[PDB]
Amino acid sequence: ILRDNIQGITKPAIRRLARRGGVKRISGLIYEEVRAVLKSFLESVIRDSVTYTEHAKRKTVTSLDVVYALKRQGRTLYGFGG
Amino acid sequence: RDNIQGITKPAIRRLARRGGVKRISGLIYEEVRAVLKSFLESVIRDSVTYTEHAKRKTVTSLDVVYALKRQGRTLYGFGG
Amino acid sequence: SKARKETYSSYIYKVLKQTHPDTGISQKSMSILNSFVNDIFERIATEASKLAAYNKKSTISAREIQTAVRLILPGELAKHAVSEGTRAVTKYSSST
Amino acid sequence: ARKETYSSYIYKVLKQTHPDTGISQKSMSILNSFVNDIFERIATEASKLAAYNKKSTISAREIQTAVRLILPGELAKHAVSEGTRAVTKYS
Amino acid sequence: QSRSAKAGLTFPVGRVHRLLRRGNYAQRIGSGAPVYLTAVLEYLAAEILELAGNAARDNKKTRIIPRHLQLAIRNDDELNKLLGNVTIAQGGVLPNIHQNLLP
Amino acid sequence: SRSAKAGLTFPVGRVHRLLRRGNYAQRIGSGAPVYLTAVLEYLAAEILELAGNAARDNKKTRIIPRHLQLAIRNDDELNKLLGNVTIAQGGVLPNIHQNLL
Amino acid sequence: KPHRYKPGTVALREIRRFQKSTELLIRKLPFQRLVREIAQDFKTDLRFQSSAIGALQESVEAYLVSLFEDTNLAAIHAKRVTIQKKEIKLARRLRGE
Amino acid sequence: KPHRYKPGTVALREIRRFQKSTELLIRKLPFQRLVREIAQDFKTDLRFQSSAIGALQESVEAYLVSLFEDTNLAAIHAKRVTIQKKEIKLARRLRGE
């Protein structure tokens, strides 16, 4: 729950995700590098989310909070709380 | 007439040299010319739209700046 | 704990009925449509406001909105939307 | 005519920071674009967070939080400290 | 009676007028701008709803699955060209395959 | 001027009027323009000091566009803030790869 | 002889299935453990609701699927079909990330 | 003994010279009447001022040079010294276009 859960996105999970990109073979070192990329993106989103949460005088983080966090990325298409 | 060909083959060769390519394919010159045409048409449709809105027959620097603003280019310097 | 809210479920209902009286409607599509409506609204309004500020005019009229729409939207969509906007503003002025 | 520009203001910024090297008009234009764009971005996103914060009146705290959420760590924190100090001085 | 009915709409136009007025846009708001916005809603929502029904009949479902939303987005060139990065709400994607993979 | 009494160099009054008339809020806190101007001089001073350091690196007493370009590219925080920003006469950094050598 | 399919044979009907079906493909509880473990560092003891978790996984899934499609396009551009580290880094760099 | 340099090194010296000098690579009048031609079809009887056109040429040159740099990075990705059409299309497409 709070210790070494980065393996939640597992190697078979990464292989299945790469199946959706249209690839036949996934190399061994692909899994951990895409894990690091996902970690970086998730950290970048959640930093903005938690900073907004602190600004809003709120203790809980809502879905619309991360919606605004991703809003300044610059696309903002459909989704919950759009 | 035929003014797009005014950009010469040695000019595109130097431009690709700026891109750090030792040997450049022959079709690459005309492909670069074609993507340049697409770039200019995408910019200039918006520029002409803004010119027509602006109640002005002359395309000003601010006109080009506003045309470039929407497409995400956001240039600096000229009309900044 | 609520009295009145501004949602577009009646709008999608009647538009689908006037378009095809054979299709159902859910609320998830209602929310997604509301999101896209809001985003396109701020896009059009901000573009028109900044364009009016560019033309040193402090009064925002239908011309600014129509020009902003014609320059943001794809050419065929832009032209059709501008024609519809011109007819709508003319009929609204006639009705007053 | 008299216009509102940061010519003398950025000039005295330089004279307060680096009174040894002059500035060209190209760098004046670049700095003017930077300062203007930063101004509008902070103003608009602070206003929109305030609208989300169901407040139609903006105070120094809103600008503080807005800068702390847009800018990177060191820049945001230094801006927070200096702006809070200046606001507490003035009011 | 709201003025939308005589103009072919349904809005209480004062609602949108207030939204623009409190939106910090301009000191003077054109009266025809909210009406044109309502017309834009009517027709853009018409075409998007017909896209949603298009993708719904693509699966013979009277209700929607967000797969219908994804099909409506990706089968329309202007929607895909406009914006496609932010999350699709349970709609999935369109995995495009190549002609060199499969034997 | 009340800009100087704030410890500020950018015009506090002019920036306050821009905030009030910039379609931002009906009631603009008078400390908000001071805060904004403070951020602006902080960023401007960072840019100027980095440009001066780059000019000293190139043995030049003037801030040429190449100096400012290299100054921004040498700062990771600046690159994060300004990554797609393109500056004339700055060209690109001397980036080479040993594969083509 | 056992009906051993050649590599790449089942993939046809498999992509026929999962292109139409629109369910999730990642274990939920490990993912919520991950989002917790990254949240406590930013803010401890967060009282997570039932929401604000599925949106994150859907967004990251869409982003990584787009990145994987771009990587496959780059691999085909590289006169090959398989994925590799260089394809991923090139796709990410050309995406502005 | 004619003095003919081996191919490739003069390319490097040209690259260095174009790196030091940041002048416009396309003559002004060619861009002028190209813009005039491309604006003829949109609206007739349009006169172009002295300005607003050097900005167009500098923006096009800068973004096209960035595209060339991305294309060359993808070419090194492809392990070759030549630019190719698939290189250019991968550079364009992966940039959100």
CATH code for position C5: 1.10.20.10
Contact check, Cβ <8 Å, B76/F85: yes
Contact check, Cβ <8 Å, H93/G79: no
Q: Both tokens of residue H73?
A: 């990075």
Helix H or strand E encompassing H6? none
CA distance F22 to C26: 40
Give H63: exposed, middle or buried? Use CB within 10 Å, 0-12, 13-18, 19+.
middle
- Closest chain F CA to residue D10: F10
CA distance G67 to G73: 10
Using a CB-CB cut-off of 8 Å, the residues of chain F touching E26 are: 23
Give the torsion sign (CA, F15, F16, F17, F20): positive
CA distance F57 to C93: 67
Report the SS3 class of residue D41: helix
CA distance E31 to C63: 12
CA distance B74 to E65: 39
Q: Both tokens of residue G56?
A: 């994150």
Between positions 38 and 57 of D, the ones with CB within 8 A of A are 45, 49, 52-53
Q: Are H68 and B19 in contact (CB under 8 A)?
A: yes
Q: CA D40 → CA B60, D19, D43, G73, G75, distances in Å?
A: 24, 29, 5, 39, 42
CA distance B18 to H15: 6
Report the SS3 class of residue F20: helix
Secondary structure (DSSP) of B39-77: HHHHHHHHHHHHHHHTT-SEE-HHHHHHHHHHTT----S
Give the torsion sign (CA, E92, E93, E99, E101): negative
Residues 6 or more apart in contact with residue B10 via CB below 8 angstroms: none
Using a CB-CB cut-off of 8 Å, the residues of chain E touching G59 are: 86-87
Residue type, B10: P
CA distance H10 to H26: 21
The answer to whether chain C touches chain E by having 3 or more C-beta pairs less than 8 angstroms apart is: yes
Contact check, Cβ <8 Å, H95/G96: yes
CA distance B41 to B39: 6
Q: Are H69 and G69 in contact (CB under 8 A)?
A: no
CA distance E38 to B65: 31
Q: Are E73 and E80 in contact (CB under 8 A)?
A: yes
Closest CA to E25 of A73, C64, B68: C64
Residue type, F89: Q
Q: Are E26 and C58 in contact (CB under 8 A)?
A: yes
Number of D/F CB contacts below 8 angstroms equals: 146
Q: Are H48 and B58 in contact (CB under 8 A)?
A: yes
Q: Are G15 and E95 in contact (CB under 8 A)?
A: yes
Q: How far apart are the first and last CA of chain C?
A: 37
Interchain contact F23–E (C-beta under 8 A): yes
Using a CB-CB cut-off of 8 Å, the residues of chain B touching F87 are: 76
Residues 6 or more apart in contact with residue E103 via CB below 8 angstroms: G6, G8, G9
E interface with G, Cβ–Cβ below 8 Å? 65-67, 70, 84-98, 100-103
Other beta carbons less than 10 A from residue G76's beta carbon? 19
Q: Are F44 and D35 in contact (CB under 8 A)?
A: yes
- Among F73, F92, F95, F100, the strongest candidate for a mutation testing the H interface, having the largest count of H CBs within 10 A, is F100
**Could you tell me if residue H80 is left (phi over 0), alpha (psi between -120 and 50 degrees) or otherwise beta?**
beta
Contact check, Cβ <8 Å, F86/B76: yes
Q: What is Dmax (Cα atoms) for chain F?
A: 63
The answer to whether chain A touches chain F by having 3 or more C-beta pairs less than 8 angstroms apart is: no
Residues, chain C, total? 96
The experimental resolution of this structure, in angstroms, equals: 4.7
CA E13 to chain centre: 20
Q: How was this structure determined?
A: cryo-EM
* Residue B34 φ then ψ, to 5°: -70, -45
Interchain contact E24–F (C-beta under 8 A): yes
CA B10 to chain centre: 18
Contact check, Cβ <8 Å, F91/H19: yes
Report the SS3 class of residue F37: helix
- Domain boundary assignment for chain H: 1-97
Q: CA E98 → CA E103, G72, G74, distances in Å?
A: 11, 9, 12
Please name every residue paired with D57 in a beta bridge, in sequence order, or none if there are none.
F27
Q: Both tokens of residue G63?
A: 């982003």
Residues 6 or more apart in contact with residue H34 via CB below 8 angstroms: B3, B4, B6, B40
Mapping DSSP onto H, E and C, the string for chain E reads CCCCCCCCCCCCHHHHHHHHHCCCCCCCCCCHHHHHHHHHHHHHHHHHHHHHHHHHHCCCCCCCCHHHHHHHHHCCHHHHHHCCCCCCCCCCCCCCCCCCCCC
- Closest chain E CA to residue C96: E3
Please name every residue paired with H83 in a beta bridge, in sequence order, or none if there are none.
B24
Q: Both tokens of residue F90?
A: 């700055």
Q: Are F20 and F29 in contact (CB under 8 A)?
A: no
Other beta carbons less than 10 A from residue H60's beta carbon? 17
Residues 6 or more apart in contact with residue C46 via CB below 8 angstroms: E25
Contact check, Cβ <8 Å, F86/H19: no
The set of chains that have 3 or more CB pairs under 8 A with B is: C, D, F, H
Report the SS3 class of residue F82: coil
Other beta carbons less than 10 A from residue E58's beta carbon? 13
A interface with E, Cβ–Cβ below 8 Å? 20-22, 24, 70, 73, 75-80
Other beta carbons less than 10 A from residue G58's beta carbon? 20
Report the SS3 class of residue F8: coil
Interchain contact D60–A (C-beta under 8 A): no
Using a CB-CB cut-off of 8 Å, the residues of chain B touching H59 are: 43, 68, 73, 75
CA distance G74 to H97: 15
Number of A/D CB contacts below 8 angstroms equals: 19
Interchain contact C27–A (C-beta under 8 A): no
Give the torsion sign (CA, A58, D66, E25, F16): positive
CA distance F32 to F55: 35
CA distance E53 to E69: 9
* Residue E48 φ then ψ, to 5°: -70, -40
Residues 6 or more apart in contact with residue H83 via CB below 8 angstroms: B16, B19, B21, B24, B25, B28, H68, H71, H72, H75
Helix H or strand E encompassing B23? strand B23-24
Interchain contact D59–B (C-beta under 8 A): no
Q: How far is A70 from chain E (nearest CA, A)?
A: 8
Q: Both tokens of residue F31?
A: 């400390």
Mapping DSSP onto H, E and C, the string for H61-81 reads HHHHHHHHHHHHHHHHHCCCC
CA distance E37 to E11: 10
- Closest chain E CA to residue A78: E88
**What CATH number should be reported for the domain holding residue A70?**
1.10.20.10
CA distance G34 to A2: 7
Secondary structure (DSSP) of chain C: --------HHHHHHHHHHH-TT----HHHHHHHHHHHHHHHHHHHHHHHHHHHHTT-----HHHHHHHHHHHS-HHHHHHHHHHHHHHHHHHHHH-
Using a CB-CB cut-off of 8 Å, the residues of chain D touching A54 are: 65
The count of structural domains within chain D is: 1
Question: Which of F28, F39, F68 is opposite residue D79, by nearest beta carbon?
Answer: F39
Q: CA E16 → CA C81, C93, E47, G72, distances in Å?
A: 19, 18, 22, 46
Q: Are B60 and C56 in contact (CB under 8 A)?
A: no
Give F39: exposed, middle or buried? Use CB within 10 Å, 0-12, 13-18, 19+.
buried
CATH number attached to the domain at H1-97: 1.10.20.10
Interchain contact D58–F (C-beta under 8 A): yes
CA distance B37 to B43: 10
Please name every residue paired with H47 in a beta bridge, in sequence order, or none if there are none.
B58
Q: What is the DSSP letter of G6?
A: P
Closest CA to C14 of E46, E55, E14, E68: E46
CA distance B77 to C15: 48
Residues 6 or more apart in contact with residue C55 via CB below 8 angstroms: B53, B54, B55, C64
Query: Hunting for tokens 């000191």 — which residue is that?
Result: E27
The rounded radius of gyration (Å) of the Cα atoms in chain B is: 16
Q: CA F94 → CA B41, E56, H20, distances in Å?
A: 33, 55, 11
- Closest chain B CA to residue F97: B20
CA D54 to chain centre: 24
Q: How far is B2 from chain F (nearest CA, A)?
A: 31
Please name every residue paired with B24 in a beta bridge, in sequence order, or none if there are none.
H83
Secondary structure (DSSP) of D23-56: --HHHHHHHHHHHHHHHHHHHHHHHHHHHHTT-S
Enclosing domain of residue A51: 1-81
Q: Are E93 and A20 in contact (CB under 8 A)?
A: yes
**Could you tell me if residue F62 is left (phi over 0), alpha (psi between -120 and 50 degrees) or otherwise beta?**
beta
